[PDB]
Amino acid sequence: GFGGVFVGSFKIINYHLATIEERQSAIYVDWQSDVLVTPIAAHGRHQIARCKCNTGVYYCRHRDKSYPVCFEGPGIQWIEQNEYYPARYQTNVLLAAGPAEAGDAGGLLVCPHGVIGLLTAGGGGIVAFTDIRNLLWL
Amino acid sequence: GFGGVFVGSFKIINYHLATIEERQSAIYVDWQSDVLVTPIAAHGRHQIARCKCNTGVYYCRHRDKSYPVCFEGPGIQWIEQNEYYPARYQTNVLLAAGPAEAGDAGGLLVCPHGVIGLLTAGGGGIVAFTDIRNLLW
Ligand SMILES: [Zn+2]
Ligand SMILES: [Zn+2]
């Protein structure tokens, strides 16, 4: 439930966690929503949820535990935790209450329909995800 | 968020929602846990969780809504009377608190590691799934 989404031969990861090579091969990139889609050699079978679920379960890494959360629908939110990014509005942000700290970014938030998003930032009982439900042919 | 679990080149479905063709072709069947596994032509969509999670999110079809659950872990449980499977014990049961009515069978219960089980029964404030995390080798 960590790393990123492996939908076939394309990897979805946070913009702030991508490598130089991934940036060189990237097909979709969004600094505002902190997302990057690039072709990779590690083929996978993850699926993107083409749904409207507002409830899900996400993997927290510094606890190695899965936490269910009801989260607020995707929208523009003011975020200053990821000091990689300065205090700014991010787009496609899902906010919820739950454990999250440095290094948890990239963990999977999923619902029965598939992957909803990727953990972006978190601190002090608040966890944030980037909503990927409109990526790779929404 | 309903119907089978399509993994690799197999479909994993409820025993009582299985068709004749897939019952005859199945490489695995277990009536006591309500499970059937058969090769499927369709390409993979899902992954089987190989975890010890006691928490997940399941899809209730009669409300078209996902709900989060904490379940006790696989075990043997008494299942009350049902249309296809009358009152009896069922094996590899996960039990949780949530809505459930007739026809909700086949809903997916999932976690970040993949699909954990399928809804098999439910009434009052209790819902019960079949654990599929043991279909290895
Ligand atoms: Zn969903
Ligand atoms: Zn799990």
Side-chain angles (χ1 to χ4, degrees), chain A residues 49-56 71 110-116 133, chain B residues 1 57 59 66:
Chain A
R50 314 296 196 185
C51 75
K52 311 225 209 177
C53 282
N54 293 283
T55 300
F71 58 86
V110 310
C111 70
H113 313 81
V115 189
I116 285 165
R133 288 181 284 199
Chain B
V57 174
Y59 175 65
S66 300

PDB file of all heavy atoms in Angstrom, chain A residues 49-56 71 110-116 133, chain B residues 1 57 59 66, ligand 1:
ATOM      1  N   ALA A  49      -9.991   4.248  -9.292  1.00  0.00           N
ATOM      2  CA  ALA A  49     -11.412   4.254  -8.964  1.00  0.00           C
ATOM      3  C   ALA A  49     -12.096   5.378  -9.723  1.00  0.00           C
ATOM      4  O   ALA A  49     -11.807   6.554  -9.499  1.00  0.00           O
ATOM      5  CB  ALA A  49     -11.613   4.421  -7.462  1.00  0.00           C
ATOM      6  N   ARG A  50     -13.002   5.025 -10.621  1.00  0.00           N
ATOM      7  CA  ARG A  50     -13.784   6.015 -11.355  1.00  0.00           C
ATOM      8  C   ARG A  50     -15.118   6.250 -10.654  1.00  0.00           C
ATOM      9  O   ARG A  50     -16.193   6.117 -11.227  1.00  0.00           O
ATOM     10  CB  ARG A  50     -13.981   5.564 -12.796  1.00  0.00           C
ATOM     11  CG  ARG A  50     -12.712   5.057 -13.446  1.00  0.00           C
ATOM     12  CD  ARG A  50     -11.674   6.158 -13.554  1.00  0.00           C
ATOM     13  NE  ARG A  50     -10.615   5.819 -14.494  1.00  0.00           N
ATOM     14  CZ  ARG A  50      -9.531   6.557 -14.702  1.00  0.00           C
ATOM     15  NH1 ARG A  50      -9.352   7.688 -14.036  1.00  0.00           N
ATOM     16  NH2 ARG A  50      -8.624   6.164 -15.582  1.00  0.00           N
ATOM     17  N   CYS A  51     -15.014   6.630  -9.384  1.00  0.00           N
ATOM     18  CA  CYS A  51     -16.164   6.698  -8.495  1.00  0.00           C
ATOM     19  C   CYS A  51     -16.296   8.067  -7.848  1.00  0.00           C
ATOM     20  O   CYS A  51     -15.594   9.011  -8.221  1.00  0.00           O
ATOM     21  CB  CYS A  51     -16.038   5.642  -7.405  1.00  0.00           C
ATOM     22  SG  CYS A  51     -14.835   6.083  -6.147  1.00  0.00           S
ATOM     23  N   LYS A  52     -17.194   8.176  -6.870  1.00  0.00           N
ATOM     24  CA  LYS A  52     -17.367   9.395  -6.091  1.00  0.00           C
ATOM     25  C   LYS A  52     -17.379   9.089  -4.600  1.00  0.00           C
ATOM     26  O   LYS A  52     -18.022   9.792  -3.820  1.00  0.00           O
ATOM     27  CB  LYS A  52     -18.643  10.122  -6.502  1.00  0.00           C
ATOM     28  CG  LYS A  52     -18.786  10.289  -7.996  1.00  0.00           C
ATOM     29  CD  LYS A  52     -19.217  11.691  -8.361  1.00  0.00           C
ATOM     30  CE  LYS A  52     -20.021  11.713  -9.648  1.00  0.00           C
ATOM     31  NZ  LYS A  52     -20.512  13.074  -9.977  1.00  0.00           N
ATOM     32  N   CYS A  53     -16.672   8.040  -4.190  1.00  0.00           N
ATOM     33  CA  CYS A  53     -16.625   7.677  -2.782  1.00  0.00           C
ATOM     34  C   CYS A  53     -15.979   8.784  -1.967  1.00  0.00           C
ATOM     35  O   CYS A  53     -14.992   9.391  -2.386  1.00  0.00           O
ATOM     36  CB  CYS A  53     -15.848   6.376  -2.593  1.00  0.00           C
ATOM     37  SG  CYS A  53     -16.747   4.895  -3.010  1.00  0.00           S
ATOM     38  N   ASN A  54     -16.547   9.046  -0.793  1.00  0.00           N
ATOM     39  CA  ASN A  54     -15.986   9.992   0.160  1.00  0.00           C
ATOM     40  C   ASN A  54     -15.498   9.293   1.422  1.00  0.00           C
ATOM     41  O   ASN A  54     -15.211   9.950   2.425  1.00  0.00           O
ATOM     42  CB  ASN A  54     -17.013  11.070   0.499  1.00  0.00           C
ATOM     43  CG  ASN A  54     -17.325  11.973  -0.686  1.00  0.00           C
ATOM     44  OD1 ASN A  54     -16.547  12.863  -1.028  1.00  0.00           O
ATOM     45  ND2 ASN A  54     -18.468  11.743  -1.319  1.00  0.00           N
ATOM     46  N   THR A  55     -15.393   7.969   1.378  1.00  0.00           N
ATOM     47  CA  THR A  55     -14.879   7.153   2.466  1.00  0.00           C
ATOM     48  C   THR A  55     -13.847   6.191   1.902  1.00  0.00           C
ATOM     49  O   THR A  55     -14.006   5.692   0.787  1.00  0.00           O
ATOM     50  CB  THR A  55     -16.010   6.377   3.147  1.00  0.00           C
ATOM     51  OG1 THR A  55     -16.977   7.294   3.670  1.00  0.00           O
ATOM     52  CG2 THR A  55     -15.475   5.514   4.266  1.00  0.00           C
ATOM     53  N   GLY A  56     -12.793   5.926   2.662  1.00  0.00           N
ATOM     54  CA  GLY A  56     -11.763   5.042   2.148  1.00  0.00           C
ATOM     55  C   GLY A  56     -10.883   4.525   3.260  1.00  0.00           C
ATOM     56  O   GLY A  56     -11.112   4.793   4.439  1.00  0.00           O
ATOM     57  N   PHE A  71     -13.319  11.477   4.310  1.00  0.00           N
ATOM     58  CA  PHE A  71     -12.538  12.624   3.882  1.00  0.00           C
ATOM     59  C   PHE A  71     -13.424  13.583   3.106  1.00  0.00           C
ATOM     60  O   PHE A  71     -14.442  13.193   2.531  1.00  0.00           O
ATOM     61  CB  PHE A  71     -11.338  12.193   3.024  1.00  0.00           C
ATOM     62  CG  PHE A  71     -11.717  11.425   1.802  1.00  0.00           C
ATOM     63  CD1 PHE A  71     -12.057  12.078   0.636  1.00  0.00           C
ATOM     64  CD2 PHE A  71     -11.733  10.046   1.818  1.00  0.00           C
ATOM     65  CE1 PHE A  71     -12.407  11.374  -0.484  1.00  0.00           C
ATOM     66  CE2 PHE A  71     -12.081   9.337   0.699  1.00  0.00           C
ATOM     67  CZ  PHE A  71     -12.419  10.000  -0.456  1.00  0.00           C
ATOM     68  N   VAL A 110      -7.571   3.815  -0.774  1.00  0.00           N
ATOM     69  CA  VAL A 110      -8.365   3.008  -1.682  1.00  0.00           C
ATOM     70  C   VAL A 110      -9.783   2.878  -1.156  1.00  0.00           C
ATOM     71  O   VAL A 110     -10.064   3.078   0.027  1.00  0.00           O
ATOM     72  CB  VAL A 110      -7.759   1.607  -1.899  1.00  0.00           C
ATOM     73  CG1 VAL A 110      -6.295   1.713  -2.236  1.00  0.00           C
ATOM     74  CG2 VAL A 110      -7.959   0.755  -0.673  1.00  0.00           C
ATOM     75  N   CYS A 111     -10.674   2.542  -2.070  1.00  0.00           N
ATOM     76  CA  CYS A 111     -12.050   2.166  -1.795  1.00  0.00           C
ATOM     77  C   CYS A 111     -12.355   0.940  -2.632  1.00  0.00           C
ATOM     78  O   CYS A 111     -11.524   0.500  -3.431  1.00  0.00           O
ATOM     79  CB  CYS A 111     -13.009   3.317  -2.133  1.00  0.00           C
ATOM     80  SG  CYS A 111     -13.171   3.627  -3.870  1.00  0.00           S
ATOM     81  N   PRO A 112     -13.536   0.349  -2.469  1.00  0.00           N
ATOM     82  CA  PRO A 112     -13.850  -0.858  -3.242  1.00  0.00           C
ATOM     83  C   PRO A 112     -13.709  -0.681  -4.740  1.00  0.00           C
ATOM     84  O   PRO A 112     -13.463  -1.662  -5.449  1.00  0.00           O
ATOM     85  CB  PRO A 112     -15.298  -1.143  -2.832  1.00  0.00           C
ATOM     86  CG  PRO A 112     -15.386  -0.634  -1.461  1.00  0.00           C
ATOM     87  CD  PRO A 112     -14.547   0.599  -1.430  1.00  0.00           C
ATOM     88  N   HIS A 113     -13.860   0.536  -5.249  1.00  0.00           N
ATOM     89  CA  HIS A 113     -13.748   0.764  -6.683  1.00  0.00           C
ATOM     90  C   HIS A 113     -12.306   0.828  -7.161  1.00  0.00           C
ATOM     91  O   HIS A 113     -12.059   0.657  -8.357  1.00  0.00           O
ATOM     92  CB  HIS A 113     -14.468   2.052  -7.059  1.00  0.00           C
ATOM     93  CG  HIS A 113     -15.827   2.177  -6.453  1.00  0.00           C
ATOM     94  ND1 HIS A 113     -16.028   2.598  -5.158  1.00  0.00           N
ATOM     95  CD2 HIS A 113     -17.054   1.938  -6.966  1.00  0.00           C
ATOM     96  CE1 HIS A 113     -17.322   2.610  -4.898  1.00  0.00           C
ATOM     97  NE2 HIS A 113     -17.967   2.220  -5.981  1.00  0.00           N
ATOM     98  N   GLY A 114     -11.360   1.063  -6.271  1.00  0.00           N
ATOM     99  CA  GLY A 114      -9.965   1.116  -6.630  1.00  0.00           C
ATOM    100  C   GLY A 114      -9.257   2.191  -5.843  1.00  0.00           C
ATOM    101  O   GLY A 114      -9.697   2.593  -4.774  1.00  0.00           O
ATOM    102  N   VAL A 115      -8.152   2.662  -6.394  1.00  0.00           N
ATOM    103  CA  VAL A 115      -7.344   3.671  -5.731  1.00  0.00           C
ATOM    104  C   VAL A 115      -7.997   5.031  -5.919  1.00  0.00           C
ATOM    105  O   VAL A 115      -8.313   5.430  -7.043  1.00  0.00           O
ATOM    106  CB  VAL A 115      -5.912   3.660  -6.277  1.00  0.00           C
ATOM    107  CG1 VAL A 115      -5.020   4.538  -5.439  1.00  0.00           C
ATOM    108  CG2 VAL A 115      -5.380   2.247  -6.312  1.00  0.00           C
ATOM    109  N   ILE A 116      -8.217   5.735  -4.815  1.00  0.00           N
ATOM    110  CA  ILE A 116      -8.750   7.089  -4.852  1.00  0.00           C
ATOM    111  C   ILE A 116      -7.633   8.109  -4.970  1.00  0.00           C
ATOM    112  O   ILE A 116      -7.716   9.049  -5.762  1.00  0.00           O
ATOM    113  CB  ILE A 116      -9.605   7.351  -3.594  1.00  0.00           C
ATOM    114  CG1 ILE A 116     -10.951   6.643  -3.704  1.00  0.00           C
ATOM    115  CG2 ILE A 116      -9.798   8.839  -3.392  1.00  0.00           C
ATOM    116  CD1 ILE A 116     -11.689   6.546  -2.406  1.00  0.00           C
ATOM    117  N   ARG A 133      -8.530  10.251  -9.274  1.00  0.00           N
ATOM    118  CA  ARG A 133      -9.666   9.585  -9.891  1.00  0.00           C
ATOM    119  C   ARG A 133      -9.985  10.114 -11.279  1.00  0.00           C
ATOM    120  O   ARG A 133     -10.920   9.610 -11.907  1.00  0.00           O
ATOM    121  CB  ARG A 133     -10.890   9.714  -8.987  1.00  0.00           C
ATOM    122  CG  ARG A 133     -10.802   8.866  -7.732  1.00  0.00           C
ATOM    123  CD  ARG A 133     -12.033   9.004  -6.879  1.00  0.00           C
ATOM    124  NE  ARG A 133     -12.031  10.269  -6.161  1.00  0.00           N
ATOM    125  CZ  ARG A 133     -12.769  10.526  -5.092  1.00  0.00           C
ATOM    126  NH1 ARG A 133     -13.588   9.608  -4.610  1.00  0.00           N
ATOM    127  NH2 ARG A 133     -12.693  11.709  -4.512  1.00  0.00           N
TER     128      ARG A 133
ATOM    129  N   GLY B   1     -17.473  -2.477  -7.657  1.00  0.00           N
ATOM    130  CA  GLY B   1     -17.418  -2.747  -6.216  1.00  0.00           C
ATOM    131  C   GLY B   1     -18.404  -3.815  -5.826  1.00  0.00           C
ATOM    132  O   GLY B   1     -18.864  -3.760  -4.721  1.00  0.00           O
ATOM    133  N   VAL B  57     -12.653  -1.339   4.036  1.00  0.00           N
ATOM    134  CA  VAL B  57     -13.829  -0.629   3.550  1.00  0.00           C
ATOM    135  C   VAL B  57     -14.574  -1.547   2.598  1.00  0.00           C
ATOM    136  O   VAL B  57     -13.969  -2.143   1.705  1.00  0.00           O
ATOM    137  CB  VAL B  57     -13.460   0.694   2.854  1.00  0.00           C
ATOM    138  CG1 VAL B  57     -14.687   1.334   2.245  1.00  0.00           C
ATOM    139  CG2 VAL B  57     -12.828   1.637   3.838  1.00  0.00           C
ATOM    140  N   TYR B  59     -18.269  -2.319   0.179  1.00  0.00           N
ATOM    141  CA  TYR B  59     -19.290  -1.676  -0.637  1.00  0.00           C
ATOM    142  C   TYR B  59     -20.647  -2.310  -0.362  1.00  0.00           C
ATOM    143  O   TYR B  59     -20.868  -3.478  -0.690  1.00  0.00           O
ATOM    144  CB  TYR B  59     -18.947  -1.782  -2.120  1.00  0.00           C
ATOM    145  CG  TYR B  59     -20.024  -1.238  -3.025  1.00  0.00           C
ATOM    146  CD1 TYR B  59     -20.356   0.107  -3.014  1.00  0.00           C
ATOM    147  CD2 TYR B  59     -20.709  -2.072  -3.889  1.00  0.00           C
ATOM    148  CE1 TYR B  59     -21.338   0.602  -3.835  1.00  0.00           C
ATOM    149  CE2 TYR B  59     -21.689  -1.586  -4.712  1.00  0.00           C
ATOM    150  CZ  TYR B  59     -22.001  -0.252  -4.683  1.00  0.00           C
ATOM    151  OH  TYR B  59     -22.981   0.224  -5.512  1.00  0.00           O
ATOM    152  N   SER B  66     -19.869   3.041   0.199  1.00  0.00           N
ATOM    153  CA  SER B  66     -18.801   2.356   0.903  1.00  0.00           C
ATOM    154  C   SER B  66     -18.827   2.714   2.381  1.00  0.00           C
ATOM    155  O   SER B  66     -19.121   3.849   2.754  1.00  0.00           O
ATOM    156  CB  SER B  66     -17.449   2.711   0.298  1.00  0.00           C
ATOM    157  OG  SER B  66     -17.394   2.325  -1.060  1.00  0.00           O
TER     158      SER B  66
HETATM  159 ZN    ZN C   1     -15.203   4.380  -4.641  1.00  0.00          ZN
END
